[PDB]
From a paper:
The [name] GG genome also carries the genes for another pilus operon called spaFED9.
To study the effect of lysine and catalytic glutamate or aspartate on isopeptide bond formation and structural stability, alanine-substituted mutants were prepared. X-ray diffraction data were collected for two mutant proteins ([name] in the M-domain and K365A in the C-domain), and though no isopeptide bonds were present in each, their overall tertiary structures remain unchanged. For the M-domain, continuous electron density shows the formation of a trans isopeptide bond between Lys186 and Asn337, with a catalytic Asp242 lying nearby. A cluster of 12 hydrophobic residues surround this isopeptide bond. Functionally, the K–N isopeptide bond probably brings stability to the M-domain by covalently connecting the two β-sheets of the CnaA fold.
Residue numbers in the entry: 37 to 52, 55 to 483
């Protein structure tokens, strides 16, 4: 007599069981391209069963399957999940050497950006509220999705999306969610003293200049803050440290390893308490003067447990606005230096004026570290034009929206023509055109 195993590979995004029956239209998301191997573990299971009870025997095999079977086995039948997450092992022996057969299921390959489902075993038979046994046994393995996201801007929450308009000086809270393996505390297969896992590296980075690393806000799992307990027992590094430029050359980022630090055994035990559960690693970065327009910068995140393999996920991109002006003489393209402006906006029937930080010495181009807005007009930063050729006043790090450039003082020898120049900042770009501004020469005597 024979038996079938239908697998229903599903996505997991939270903390979470196999009745053996079909659960029908569950309304959950499938996972295609996950290879599972099958192993008959009957003999090895029953040899364990002499000393240990059934739950203990199963636990023992769940961790360290490669101890009890050969995982790199050509003989072992492999099945890959299809577009609906379906995969079936057909035609297995319901009994093996006089006992009801016990089969194990190892996820051999696990697609991006998913962590593997636990190694599960099934001891036959599975029976119902009438004593009849199943012929086809439905299993619902769970691949935990690795995510990355931008969650807060200046400590305020924001609607999740793939492209965020920022302002220079903004603090951006990013997050990386991922699973703690169910076999984290396990020892290596065929080893008494060495551990299975000896690396648990999370590596976030931008390949472009926009951000500057601030901090590592929190680490949370099961609604518990871990970081406070963790810090000093794990290897940590940001792009602010000189160690970063040796191992990487990414402009921004950080690399945390739980099992790469001073006290890896201590952490492994803590990690085991929440084994299987999903952690979240929050970190902040600040938008610097090197964040420019016509630029979309995301970060990536590389979760890994060895140098050989890694799970890579991408978060949302960020861009910021800029604008150029060309202050000229009326009826020519002669550049006019030392024309004085201030930047204005409305804030609901109320006028505000821009104050720029980190802006001294700068004349033509302005590349501030922050911008704030005051109703006291005399406190606004007075902008000066250069003698530059195609554009002699540029400003960056603005949010998209509507502004007004207000000429406070014309350059000497000239009178103001258009005192108030209304203009729109376009999302993530320098804008449609460089905005020309004429000035009338007064032929003085």
């Amino acid at each position: 007599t024979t038996v079938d195993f239908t697998l229903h590979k599903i996505e997991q995004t939270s903390d979470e069981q196999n009745t053996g029956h079909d659960l029908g239209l569950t309304g959950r998301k499938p996972v295609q391209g996950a290879q599972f191997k099958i192993f008959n573990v009957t003999d090895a299971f029953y040899q364990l069963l002499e000393n240990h009870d059934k739950t203990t025997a199963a636990s023992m095999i769940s961790q360290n399957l490669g101890q009890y079977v050969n995982l790199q086995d050509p003989n072992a039948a492999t099945v890959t999940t299809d577009a609906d997450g379906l995969a079936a092992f057909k035609g297995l022996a319901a009994k093996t050497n006089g006992r009801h057969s016990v089969y194990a299921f190892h996820e051999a390959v696990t697609p991006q950006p998913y962590q593997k489902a636990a190694d599960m075993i099934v001891s036959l038979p599975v029976r119902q509220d009438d004593g009849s046994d199943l012929t086809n046994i439905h299993l619902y393995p769970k691949d935990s999705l690795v995510t990355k996201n931008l969650t807060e801007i200046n400590e305020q929450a924001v609607a999740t999306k793939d492209l965020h308009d920022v302002a220079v000086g903004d603090v951006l809270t990013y997050q990386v969610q991922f699973q703690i393996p169910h076999d984290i505390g396990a020892l290596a297969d065929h080893s008494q003293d060495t551990f299975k896992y000896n690396q648990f590296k999370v590596l976030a980075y931008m390949t472009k200049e926009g951000l500057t690393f601030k901090a590592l806000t929190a680490i949370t799992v099961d609604g518990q803050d871990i970081l406070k307990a963790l810090t000093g027992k794990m290897a940590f590094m940001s792009s602010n440290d000189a160690a970063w430029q040796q191992t990487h050359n990414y402009p921004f980022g950080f690399e945390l390893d739980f099992l790469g630090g001073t006290d890896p055994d201590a952490v492994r035990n803590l990690l085991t308490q929440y084994a299987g559960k999903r952690v979240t690693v929050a970190y902040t970065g600040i938008v610097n003067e090197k964040m420019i327009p016509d630029q979309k910068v995301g970060n990536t995140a590389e979760v890994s447990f060895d140098p050989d393999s890694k799970i890579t996920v991408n978060g949302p991109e960020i861009q910021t606005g800029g604008i150029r002006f060309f202050k000229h003489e009326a009826g020519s393209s002669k550049s006019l230096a030392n024309a004085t402006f201030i930047l204005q906006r409305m804030n609901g029937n109320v006028r505000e004026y821009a104050v720029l930080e980190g802006v001294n010495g700068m004349a033509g181009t302005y590349q501030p570290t922050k911008i704030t807005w005051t109703t006291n007009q005399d406190a606004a930063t007075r902008l000066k034009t250069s003698g530059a050729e195609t554009a002699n006043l540029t400003i960056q790090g603005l949010l998209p929206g509507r502004y007004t450039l207000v000429e406070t003082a014309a350059p000497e020898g000239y009178e103001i023509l258009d005192p108030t120049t209304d203009f729109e900042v376009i999302a993530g770009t320098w804008g449609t055109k460089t905005i020309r501004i004429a000035n009338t020469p007064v032929n003085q005597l």
